[PDB]
From a paper:
Here, we report the discovery of a new LAP BGC in the genome of Rhizobium sp. Similar to KLB and erythromycin (ERY), PHZ induces expression of Katushka2S but not RFP, indicating that PHZ is an inhibitor of translation. The newly discovered antibiotic PHZ represents the second known example of a linear azole-containing peptide with a known mechanism of action and mode of binding to its intracellular target, the ribosome. Although the PHZ and the previously described LAP klebsazolicin both inhibit the elongation step of prokaryotic translation through the obstruction of the NPET of the large ribosomal subunit, the mode of binding of PHZ to the bacterial ribosome is significantly different from that of KLB.
First, three azoles (Thz3, Oxz15, and Oxz18) are involved in π–π stacking with nucleotides A751, C2611, and U2609, respectively.
Residue numbers in the entry:
A (entry chain CC): 2 to 272
B (entry chain C3): 1 to 46
C (entry chain A): 2 to 23
D (entry chain CU): 1 to 93
Write the structure that this text describes.
Amino acid sequence: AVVKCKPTSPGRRHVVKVVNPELHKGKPFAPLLEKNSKSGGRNNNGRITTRHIGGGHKQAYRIVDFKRNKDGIPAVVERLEYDPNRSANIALVLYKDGERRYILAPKGLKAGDQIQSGVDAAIKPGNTLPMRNIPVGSTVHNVEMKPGKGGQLARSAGTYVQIVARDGAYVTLRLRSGEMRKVEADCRATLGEVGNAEHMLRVLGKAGAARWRGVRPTVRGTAMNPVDHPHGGGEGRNFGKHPVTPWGVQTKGKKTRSNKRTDKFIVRRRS
Amino acid sequence: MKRTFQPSVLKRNRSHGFRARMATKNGRQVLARRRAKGRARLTVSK
Amino acid sequence: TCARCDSXSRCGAXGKXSGXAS
Amino acid sequence: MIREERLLKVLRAPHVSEKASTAMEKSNTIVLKVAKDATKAEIKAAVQKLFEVEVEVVNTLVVKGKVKRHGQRIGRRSDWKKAYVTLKEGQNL
RNA sequence: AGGACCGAACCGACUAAUGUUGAAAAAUUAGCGGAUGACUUGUGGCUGGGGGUGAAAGGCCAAUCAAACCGGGAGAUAGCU
RNA sequence: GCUCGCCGGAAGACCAAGGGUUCCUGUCCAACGUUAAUCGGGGCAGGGUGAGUCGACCCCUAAGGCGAGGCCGAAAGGCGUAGUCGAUGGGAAACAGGUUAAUAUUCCUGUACUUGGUGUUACUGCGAAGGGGGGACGGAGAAGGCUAUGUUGGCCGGGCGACGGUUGUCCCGGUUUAAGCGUGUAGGCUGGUUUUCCAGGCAAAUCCGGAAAAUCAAGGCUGAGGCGUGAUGACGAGGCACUACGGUGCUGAAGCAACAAAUGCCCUGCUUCCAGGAAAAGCCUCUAAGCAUCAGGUAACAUCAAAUCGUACCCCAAACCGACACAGGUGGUCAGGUAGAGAAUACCAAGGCGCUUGAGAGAACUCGGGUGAAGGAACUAGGCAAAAUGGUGCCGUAACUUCGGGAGAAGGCACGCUGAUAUGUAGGUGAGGUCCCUCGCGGAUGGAGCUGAAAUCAGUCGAAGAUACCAGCUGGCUGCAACUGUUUAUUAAAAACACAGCACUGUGCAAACACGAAAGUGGACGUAUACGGUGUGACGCCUGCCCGGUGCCGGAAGGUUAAUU
């Protein structure tokens, strides 16, 4: 669970770390690793397009299965592994033909559990089946949006999507944000919550803990000059504007959804 | 103190050398002006 | 040349240093 | 490695520079001046087909031209190529 | 164990004095801060001017920066000297 | 040439970068050298850089670059797939001695090693751009084994002292030796082997992975260093004849041990932590197309080949960057003695220097220091600057506190040399001898020799024993900022910026947003416990009332309202 740090120095006084002793204390599975070089927030023009990104620890990418193509073939979990690419943990599972794959680790899953994908699997956490074969009212995760595309909804550390209705070729989903959303019923999804529900309980304690995740410091706009940010200068602390982005678009209340081709999919917006 | 010019032959030839000027339209126009002026050295290159 | 040397002129003498490169 | 026109174009000059004489009487090494593109095989083939002697090995170095000046003008001598040809035991020169 | 303590290399620059046609177009001497980290450094690479980059001072972008430098418009214009 | 002085974690030695003949020798002193110059990094001329193993070139890739086609853009052009480049990384092999005025892992002597082409005897299943394994990797810490290296003893050579003494338990010097080859050790990883099947590895596969029986417990990989050979050699303190003073042809003694010991090696190990730690080839292994007494591979030996470029010299500097023979700047490696915790510091060794104007005199004043009666901050904007404190062990230590701190609070005691406990103790290392053995780089018993802290008692010297160098001033009240950090390169280091935390707001993914005429890329190979923006700034207690103004969100009734007709 979460453990306090004793304040033997400033910068340890407020640290809370999430300890999971059942994670694998060894090197990851080398056939499922690739290279993952940092961008620093730079695109192919070499420009900072997203601010406050850069530095941080080296990472290797873990190829996690989101599609879950291996229908019918049973799989046993070998072990839970730490993944630096996401807020959840992952699970090296072992199929019965000798193929090893990483998946998202759900809530109660440990080493030795039986998982199975496909159309006629069981109903237990870890199994992946289409949403036209699931009892209406259950909490799901790793939810696809197109049939075959790969799971995109509820991938985080402790999130879940609850199926609330079925009509036509569609099921209605109460997303984790508070939004009712119609998805097709050929889209696969995986039972149970994804399992790292104490991830939000950590407090980083110090500035270097944010710096070794690749988060550079954020300068307030009101600390800048008028040429730099619309929140300008002034003698002393003056604000005197309405709060906007660095590009003059009004923040703190102004909606920015303009898509108009996915309005046939949204029953109710979030709150 | 530490000065402006810290020389390096690889960076000099990758920045101002002949293949770098010939690689683009504008460096070829620079070499065209340096031939129209009568310069003995088009680029640095040595 | 370029050392500056006055509090504020374009070029005077002065033993200070923000005004002064001839 | 060999054709006779190239072998007649390889060698230029016997080199006499008071390390050449020490190398002749100490290490059985004659010191020659060769062309700027002559490889070791061409020098060895030219020494055997042109001096009638038999060669252990050929070592080569490139001598870099020295700068000599007059006023605002600076000239440079040519680069040349020195060879150390080691004979087996017997020799004429 | 620790953005832990003291302290050399190393990275900085808090105070004083010297120097100010300097040994130096920003240093020297004596003390001084950090010194396992948000550290520092070699080498290569990318971002280009109303643009970049900025733990943000309008700071830095080749001793130049409230808009670099070079060439051109160009013999701009100047009721001013 | 002899004395003196300075550096000695550098002001010594070797390189990379950069420079480009400054290297060595002869000759010259007009100009250059902040003086003179016979000298020189200066003029003139000549000489000097030798490689299958070192580096480059080469094979392979990272960030990134170019990019057939392709997509997009008035044009120029942009982005990108296949590819092809791109080291700062991965990949074959050589050391020791000597020698030139100037080159050396390159030349010579001795001893080696690696990879290709081709030839001969045999064993035969060979084949790639594809499959698999490996290459292949983080921070920190701790222990063990060593070695470089040093010290002492033994031995060998030389010395018996310009002035009291020096045949002694005295003085000075030397006591060095590599790669390769064999051994496979201290350790570290690992459970091996056979047979049968398979929805996995783009197709296949004897390979990898999975599953199941049978058998067995020693099998394989890795790995410092030690030892033997290498070595009947080389080097080596000193001597034989000579000399053109600078040495060369010549032999050449001992060349042993024990202890201490790295930041180096085993070690890319082991443990532990979260922040979860390159790629691809060489290498091994498996087959598709193709060929099967041929071709191809494998074990052994012979034979040929290993090209081309760099190599001088400087390289914390008078040779690079700074206009200068400029108190500046500049990455890596080597890292001795005594005292010390130490790469601090002090004195020294090897080695290198005395910094390219001197000679005097000994005014004011300026700079850098030393000391100072009595008073002791009276100075001044202000204790600025100086003075002062300063080390190890031990005793002791307040308010407050977030229970960690405060704290090295404050404050104080001992400290040198000699003798004894003990001809040198506890501890550390560890020979000879006895026995056992899966028989060696072993295990017990052992304890010599070597090294050696701190303590206690007594004595004794001085004014002073942390004697030099080195080396905290301390306490009390209070503002701001929680803190470590960051910042106006060159007048401002701060109460500013950041910060962990908190909140509000947007964002349902082909996301919001950003860069871009666009294609597209970042966000992100992430998915609302995530991401972008904005404000406040740890933590404790809290965060009140106002929606009339402006903004934002919601609503659609009515009015007003553009292009169009």
